Every structure is written in C-alpha cells, then in structure tokens.
C-alpha cells in the first residue's frame, strides 16, 4: 500500500560549467573556487609544464577539473515493511452455471 | 525498484551494492549526488590538458 | 628572497551552525541541506529509536 523510497540512483546525467585550473611544479595543488560544492565532481592529476606553458622549473605540475553534475533520469528504490499490504484471493465454487 | 515506466523486485543488499551516483530517498532538492565518479570519466591521454 | 606557499594548515578552529538530522530505522540514510557544502563537517552514525 504505502512504500517509502530509501535510495534514489540516477541513470543519465550531463556535465555543465566545466572548468579546470593548473599550478606550477612542486608548489602545491591547484585550488578551484567551485570545488567547495559537492555538485562539482573533482579530479586531481599531473600535467607537464614548463616555459612554453609559462611557469618555469620544467616539471610535472598539478591540475584539477570540475563540472556541475545535474541529472536527467532517476530510479527510485521503494521499500515496504511486512504490514500494511494485502493479498486479494478469489474463491469460486463448482457446479458451473452457463459460460 | 522503479525505473522510467517499469518496475522490478530486487534484493536489498544487491540494490545497495549497485555502482551509480545515488541519493537518499528522503533527500529533497536532489543536488548532492554522492558517488558521481561512476558516471563521469577524466580524459588525460597525454600529459597535457585533461 | 622570494618565497611561495605550499600548503596552509589549521592550528585552531571553531564550530558554529550545528544542524542535525535523524531518520527512521530501515528507511535509508538522513540527508541535510548543508551536507552539500564542504565547509560543514559531517558524520553518519547509529542512534536507536
């Protein structure tokens, strides 16, 4: 009769507001402003940087990437407790009438 | 379980061990998706821009 | 001569704006609006009801 959902997975999503931020070798990780939301999915990794990138020291820098994670299709996992649910059962006697 | 226009009857421990970005069933204003890293990927082919 | 900061740490902090949220047994997990922000610190645990 009355279920209550416990966990909503999602199926199809999209990523908007995509942005990235990098920082020079050996002087720390980058810091992006919208890493603070838990909407934006984050990933730190290391790019190669040097004078052509405009930093110096010729090493492997750090980089971060964020994009806002919205949703389009969900599923709902509804659950019940073994009360408040009924079974409908039919009891037809014999000695059949027409059709 | 209840997808777009169908529905099934799945095991509970199977349903909780299911890798997709989820959200609690009481979470109104569903912005904080939790394991979002199972529906994104991060392309760093060379050692350049990802 | 010219330094550049690597990592700032936090010697001393204060906590304000405590909001809690607790839900029924065998019905999922709690969920609160300020868990989306990452200034707030969070922990899930088990009360009996």
């Amino acid at each position: 009769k009355q279920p209550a959902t416990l966990r909503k997975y999602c199926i199809e999503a999209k990523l908007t507001n995509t942005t990235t931020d990098s920082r020079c070798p050996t002087q720390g990780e980058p810091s992006l402003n919208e890493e603070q939301d838990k909407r934006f999915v984050c990933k730190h990794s290391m790019v190669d940087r040097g004078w052509g990138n405009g930093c110096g020291l010729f090493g492997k820098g750090g980089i971060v990437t964020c994009a806002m994670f919205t949703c389009k299709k969900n599923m709902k996992g509804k659950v019940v407790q073994p009360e408040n649910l009924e079974y409908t059962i039919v009891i037809t006697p014999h000695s059949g009438e027409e059709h | 379980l209840q997808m777009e226009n169908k529905a099934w009857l799945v095991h509970r421990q199977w349903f909780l061990d299911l890798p997709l970005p989820w959200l609690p069933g009481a979470d109104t204003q569903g912005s904080n998706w939790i394991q979002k890293e199972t529906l994104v990927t991060f392309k760093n082919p060379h050692a350049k821009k990802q | 001569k010219q330094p550049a900061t690597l990592r700032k740490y936090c010697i001393e902090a204060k906590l304000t704006n405590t909001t809690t949220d607790s839900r029924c047994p065998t019905q999922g997990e709690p969920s609160l609006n300020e868990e989306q922000d990452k200034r707030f610190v969070c922990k899930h645990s088990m009360v009996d009801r």
Partner: antibody
Amino acid sequence: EVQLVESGAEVKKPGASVKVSCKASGYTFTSYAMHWVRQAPGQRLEWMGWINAGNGNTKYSQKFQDRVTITRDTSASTAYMELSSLRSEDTAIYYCARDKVDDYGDYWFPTLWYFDYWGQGTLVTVS
Amino acid sequence: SALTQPASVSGSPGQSITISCTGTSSDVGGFNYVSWFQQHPGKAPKLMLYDVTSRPSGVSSRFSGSKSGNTASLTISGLQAEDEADYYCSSHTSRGTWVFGGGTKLTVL
C-alpha cells in the same frame, strides 16, 4: 493547576525592538522546554520558538534565525522572547508553549505530546 | 514548507466527517508525530490528538485520526454544535523543526 500567564505590549512602530514574557507556574521550570508560536488574525500558526532547558540552548526557525534572540532566568521562572527589527507585516498574536525535556537534561527528542498546556497570547500592532 | 490541509469543511450535526492534511517524507511520511489543535477564536488553542491517534484526558472519544504515509487525517464522529473552531495540524521534521497546517474552520450548519 498549571497556569502560564503573559504580558501584553500595546503598540510598537516598525524598527523598535519588542519583548514579551511568560510566567510559567505550576511545575518545575528547569525541566521543561519553552516554545513560541505566532498567529496573525485569520492566518496560520508558524513556529518561532527555540528549545530551552536548564541548559538554555536554542533552535531558531529557518525563516528568521538572524532576527530573534533569547534571555531567561530560572530564579524568576520566566522565559523571555526578544524580537528586534519589528516590521509592517509582523502584527500577530504570540502564544506561549511548553513541552518536556529529556531526563538527561538536554532536549534532543520532543515528547509525543507537544503543547498540552498553553499561554494567553500577546497582541502587537504597528502604526 | 507548511502542511496542506484545506480551507474549510462543513457538516450537519450527527454526521461523521473527516479533515485531511498531506506533507512530505520528513514531516509525516516517516515519523509518528502529528497533532491537532482546536482553537476557538477568543481562546488559546487546545490540543485534540496526540502522536497519531492518541488523545488527551478531558478530550472526548469523538475525536480520532490516522495516517496513510504522507497524509494524516482527523475524523469527528458525531458532530455537535461546539466543534465550531478551526483545526490546525502539526508535525516534527527530521530536520528538527515544527510546522503547522493552514487550518480548516469547521461549521456545524
């Protein structure tokens, strides 16, 4: 035999701070919380209150958490509202409300009964 | 984020009518906290029902109610003339706060 009397403010212009008082009598004041609700004439009941104890904690409403503050004194057995920054739409009757704190002093979960015993209702206006 | 009980309701004396109110899974949908308050207009509001279906001492057994998930009800069996006051619902969220419904003023004729 439980009586909770109040005191009425006459007329407060917009901008001035207003405070009301309830004199909780008939029970141990330090082991019961003190809630505050309001009612404009012909409208709903919305919940202004906080969660008193012998501790003196608070839990304000989300609508105007940055508007109200408290004080109390168990030696006088009275709980005090403090509504500053009065506005034009804030003409309402302010009711008193009690419920019981836990046996451990704190107010974590409310009792199943909320407001068995009530107050009078304090009317404010604007001009 | 208030509850959704209707504007008003009518009943002849002797009837058994109902007053409904809906909400969300934090207000009514999980918790057994729903209360009702009768409020005569020159009077402080007086509570009619405890947690879902219980009842204070002094309140007659005419008043009853139930819950159906997100929706709670109040059935007055045997309407008399002294039920001419609006009934405000109540709840307690998972968040920690308190909400009340809109109010159903009940006429008896």
